[PDB]
Amino acid sequence: GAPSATQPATAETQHIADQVRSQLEEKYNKKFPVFKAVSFKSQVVAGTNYFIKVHVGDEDFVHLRVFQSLPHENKSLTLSNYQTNKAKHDELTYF
Amino acid sequence: MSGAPSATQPATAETQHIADQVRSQLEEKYNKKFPVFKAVSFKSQVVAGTNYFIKVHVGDEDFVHLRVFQSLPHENKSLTLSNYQTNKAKHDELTYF
Amino acid sequence: MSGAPSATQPATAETQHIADQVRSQLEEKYNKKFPVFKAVSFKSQVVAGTNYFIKVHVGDEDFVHLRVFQSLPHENKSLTLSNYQTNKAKHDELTYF
Amino acid sequence: GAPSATQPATAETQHIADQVRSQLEEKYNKKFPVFKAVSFKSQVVAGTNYFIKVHVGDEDFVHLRVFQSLPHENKSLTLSNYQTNKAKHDELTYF
């Protein structure tokens, strides 16, 4: 995907923003005096997320979250996140 | 082909090729080379949907950018919050983040 | 968000908008206008993967084109046959079909 | 998606072609003296297929298969196939 051209916000966009305002207050304690959607861009996403347990020596492991976009023969990847100080038998939980 | 994460699968050469490709970036993080970097196991999760980057006015000259995701199918109207950035300006581009 | 077809869902205005948009094309088929064209129900199926258009030599100057589909995730190696065309030439473009 | 540039066939491509040769003989009784993969293009596909039961008057219905590509705000559609002479209570089966 390639994000589209800048599009004007609609009533949906504002509904989405109203939801997000509450989430930002509740979990990241972020407050604003107004929260008015102005515009957006869209981006198609289609691929595979990998959650990978990697041994990094002795008792040490890390977990990786890596995204691989379509098509199937695409081999370029994005490291989206990771977890430090993981142990051998830890579960691969989403993050 | 669910969006549910697969069960845990043992690493293959392709899993290792992924680990090799991202290793140096991670090694920057910890400021050191890993003596070893061996893929052991993985889960896969199909992702297919639309990201939206949304510019929000939060008063005066202050803006916020949001990244939200809407999964397929097209009739799904649920979106989840992926990331946000504060301290943005009216003419700041909606660039990926 | 499976690739499994959903359960049957009653039609919504969006289902009807889809029916309206494709109606004239179908009406060409039957050589007549439908007096009515009312969406009743639907199933949805998420599709996400790679189409491949493959040129195959079948001897002398004769070729076949194939369309096959590979679903996500990336480690899926199963493909299914979607369409084929015979009577093609060595320099015929791999155009969608 | 937009199909890629023409790529040369590999051993996989040939494995896929060998499978298809058998399917074409068995179901469409098509035989060839050779079946050698030469080249391919790829195309990303990501969207929703709709199978839709449409009333077309009195006892008459049709079933439609329509593809809607991402992004979510895309409203252009492709009629991929249809079934004639359907009845009211027929199941929406894949086709």
From Swiss-Prot, chains B, C:
The record marks 3 as: Reactive site. Able to form dimers stabilized by noncovalent forces. Belongs to the cystatin family. It is found in: Cytoplasm; Nucleus. One of its GO terms (biological process) is negative regulation of proteolysis. The gene is CSTB. It is linked to Epilepsy, progressive myoclonic 1: A form of progressive myoclonic epilepsy, a clinically and genetically heterogeneous group of disorders defined by the combination of action and reflex myoclonus, other types of epileptic seizures, and progressive neurodegeneration and neurocognitive impairment. EPM1 is an autosomal recessive form characterized by severe, stimulus-sensitive myoclonus and tonic-clonic seizures. The onset, occurring between 6 and 13 years of age, is characterized by convulsions. Myoclonus begins 1 to 5 years later. The keyword Nucleus applies. This is Cystatin-B. One of its GO terms (cellular component) is extracellular region. Keywords: Acetylation, Cytoplasm, Disease variant, Epilepsy, Neurodegeneration, Nucleus, Protease inhibitor, Thiol protease inhibitor. InterPro entries: Cystatin_dom, Cystatin_sf, Prot_inh_cystat_CS, Prot_inh_stefin. SUPFAM superfamilies: Cystatin/monellin (SSF54403).
